[PDB]
């Protein structure tokens, strides 16, 4: 999972 610019979540766990 990203945080800051274009926050998104993946099925893997990031």
Strand content: under 5%
Cα radius of gyration in angstroms: 7 Å
Distance between the termini: 4 Å
Number of helices: 0
Morphology call = elongated
Structural class: little secondary structure
The helix content is under 10%
| Biggest sheet overview | none
Q: Tell me how many strands there are.
A: 0
PDB class: biosynthetic protein
Keywords: pharmacophore, sfti
Assembly: monomeric
Entry title: sfti-hfrw-2
Characterize this entry briefly:
The protein contains no helices and no strands. With 14 residues, it is mostly loops.
Q: Which tags fit this structure?
A:
14 residues, elongated, 0% helix, little secondary structure
How is this structure best described in words?
This protein has no helices and no strands. It has 14 residues and is largely without helices or strands. It is classed as biosynthetic protein. The entry lists the keywords melanocortin, pharmacophore, cyclic peptide, sfti, biosynthetic protein. The assembly is monomeric. The entry is titled "sfti-hfrw-2".
What is the topological layout?
Elements: no helix or strand
PDB class: biosynthetic protein
Keywords: melanocortin, pharmacophore, cyclic peptide, sfti, biosynthetic protein
Assembly: monomeric
């Amino acid at each position: 999972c990203t945080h800051x610019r274009w926050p998104i979540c993946f099925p893997d766990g990031r």
